[PDB]
Amino acid sequence: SEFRIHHDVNELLSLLRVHGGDGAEVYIDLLQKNRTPYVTTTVSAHSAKVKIAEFSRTPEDFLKKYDELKSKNTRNLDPLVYLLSKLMEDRETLQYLQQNAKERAELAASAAASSGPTWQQSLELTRKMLRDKQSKKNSGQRLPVLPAWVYERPALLGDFLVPIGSLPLASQEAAVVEDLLYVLVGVDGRYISAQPLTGRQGRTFLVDPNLDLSIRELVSRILPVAASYSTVTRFIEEKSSFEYGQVNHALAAAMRTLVKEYLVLVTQLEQLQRQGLLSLQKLWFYIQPAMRSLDILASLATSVDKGECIGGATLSLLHDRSFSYTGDSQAQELCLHLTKAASTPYFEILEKWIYRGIIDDPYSEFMVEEHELRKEKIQEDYNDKYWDQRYTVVQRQIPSFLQKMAGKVLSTGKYLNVVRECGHDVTCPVAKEVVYTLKERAYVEQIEKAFSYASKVLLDFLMGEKELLAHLRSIKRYFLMDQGDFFVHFMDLTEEELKKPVDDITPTRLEALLELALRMSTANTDPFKDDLKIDLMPHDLITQLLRVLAIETQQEKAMVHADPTELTLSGLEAFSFDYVVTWPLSLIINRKALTRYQMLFRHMFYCKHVERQLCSVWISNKAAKRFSLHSAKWFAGAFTLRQRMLNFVQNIQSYMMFEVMEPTWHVLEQNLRSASNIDDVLGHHASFLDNCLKDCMLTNPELLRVFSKLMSVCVMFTNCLQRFTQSMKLDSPQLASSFEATITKFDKNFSAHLLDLLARLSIYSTSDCEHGMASVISRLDFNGFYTERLERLSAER
């Protein structure tokens, strides 16, 4: 998506085959700080042109190529010419590039050795290609094609289909003026004949050789009007087809009106001639205004056709031409008329997409391109597509004077789409039509206020029909404790079967127990409990996170591909919660957010499970209530160990509850109340997840590994001790011989593990500053009973 720059620069570095230096990575960072959703590279192309020309060894070639590229009006030309012009200032850089090119060419050669133009056909090919492209893009709707006879029944559009040498001067002049009158309407005369040519241009007109040099030269000066008329009639007839977009058709209609006015003028000239009191000079003077106007129109038409430009880019071209003809009254007025006419449909579509958000793409020239996509797909798939490749910006077509506010437009419309597909759209209180204006402040201000209105109404809608606040309150109630009764009942009902192998687990009974607990409680006040489900994720925290983190060093494929099927998984690890919500209701709860929530919830739940196991172990042993406390040795020593474990877990859980939940929750619930647009709440939720996941410090391999080891060893001790208690009870193999001062061995391992964990925490904190770990260590060892050992171990490291 937006990462093309990294791939391109990496490929450039590889092709240049240079290893020294820090590479372009710092240069990539520098480039990243020049981001815009549009182009603003307009610079002095004249300076670059002159800088190239002064060095240009063959100036004519460069001039012709640049002029042709300008005629095509392709983008990116200005920055490329800028780079080319400033390239030769660094002769060493040019030499380096030339040497690299020579080396690459030689390497490729070694590897290989070892290992006239008819216009009608061109127009037909162009229209066929455009039809094919629009049919491909449409993909699901009828093609608005026209019958073939529109181009047939020729002469409908109006294209072209007696000795005079010794005659008197006045007679031949009269005949010539009659012929011109018939030719100014693009109709073949008797002594002046249009001829087919080669290439795309006007038609050359031939006359009798015996005609006088002066008169023939004058009529040659006159005929450019006829040539422009021929070109414009060809343009209007050929561009009238549906497949050229609405804007081109507005241009076509304007041309039709203007040429009709020109026909009115020429017929008035004809009726004046009917009196037989006209000559070359009179008509020559009369046509000059229309002559220049048709010159302008012919230039516009030829530029547009040679550029093959369609859509808003056409408006950009027309606006550029209008500005280039600034300072001339009639030209400016004509350009104003044409640009207003062209923008009319475009501005209609823009207003529809801005106020109502309804997209209308008869041929997909609007600035917002919609890609077919579904909503359940993103809820199911982790990859991000909706807000990235649903309503994208088309750069091939851009409006010259809207670039500075291009991106904003997108957001506005997309917001409306959210309230459009929900089927709860209303007419905006302000419906002021947007109109073309030579300046820009008016429309930028109007679109800005429309954006503000859209954002506020969308936020009100979320706070209303969707009640995002209540859903967030619920998703905080679940996955984050604070439902003590619910969690204790769930544990008490799920523990017995939680230890069964996963393959023997069917979530039907799990959800049955979940609903039984829900109905057998007093926490039903929440009305959104019906969007939860129980899943058995086929992986654990330790392996999942180790795969996530330990990458790109030596473990890209070393152990990521290992499949848990080769091993056995119990019902405690895979167990997790999943949430499903509809698209309009809390779209913010994305599959990514679901993943973060489930990871955090399963970690916290495993910690709670360990605490419950320790508490149950404490509960089981009570025979020593009024019996010998000191005696029984290893039936009584374990006491101390248990205390330790308890405090430990307590500490961490507290650090997880008060030092994670409170800060992130308060900041989220505060900043959201001041959120302005959807992006604000999206960023707030992302930061909330960031804070929660960083608090637990699950973003490091060593700490995760050591914590998992501690949990595993403590669980092993718990089950071994309960096995010992059961064996003693049934009397009052491996199990019978599991005691060899087992408490001593367990303590010996656990104390070393815990001290190593504390050393890792201290070492990482000394470089990561912060105070969360400081509070953790403060609460871990509040009293002095377990202090000196940590300092002694840290002394020698």
Binding site: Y382, N383, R547, V548, I551, V560, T595, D690, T699, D768
Partner: protein, 34 residues
């Protein structure tokens, strides 16, 4: 040099190297499932 308050930007860079580090794992595991 810097303003000595960059540690927050260090955490932001950790975020940029952790979130897309997570998503790439899902992309990888989806590659093999087909």
């Amino acid at each position: 040099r810097n303003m000595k308050d960059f540690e927050n930007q260090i955490t932001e860079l950790k975020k940029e190297n952790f979130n897309l580090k997570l998503r790439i794992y899902f992309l990888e595991e989806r590659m093999q499932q087909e």
